């Protein structure tokens, strides 16, 4: 027997079952950066202006 597969032998990415559970957190898989809080909330005009050596509004 053994019909020859020819040009259709491969590619066609194969689907396969395995009993072993997939590895989680593969390789090192360290802790997260603890990201920085994003800016939120309605903001109104600034207070009294440039605040500089002078120049109010």
């Amino acid at each position: 027997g053994w019909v020859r597969p020819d040009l259709g032998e491969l590619s066609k990415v194969t689907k396969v079952k395995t009993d072993r559970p997939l590895p989680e957190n593969p390789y090192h898989s360290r802790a997260r950066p603890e990201p920085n809080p994003e800016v939120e909330g309605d903001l109104k005009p600034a207070r009294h202006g440039s605040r500089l050596f002078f120049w109010t509004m």
């Binding site: 920085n36 809080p37 207070r47 009294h48 605040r51």
Partner: protein, 71 residues
């Protein structure tokens, strides 16, 4: 009577006016010392919004399945 009433303003008006200017520039000075404190602290902590130097973006890492051998 004539001079005072037509040409001048009561010690009331001037007085409380100075109360207001002292409000204004008071809280300004305070909040200036605040921002110097903040920006002073930010270079050390790097927490908040002001000082951010962008790293390389994770958007493109190409998570795709690759040539199998490893990595």
């Amino acid at each position: 009577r004539w001079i005072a009433r037509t040409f001048f303003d009561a010690p009331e008006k001037n007085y409380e006016r100075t109360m207001a200017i002292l409000q204004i520039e008071s809280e300004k000075a305070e909040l200036r010392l605040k921002e110097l404190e903040v920006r002073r602290l930010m270079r050390a902590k790097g927490d908040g919004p002001w000082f951010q130097y962008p790293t390389i973006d994770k958007a493109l890492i190409d998570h795709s399945p690759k040539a199998t051998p490893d990595n």
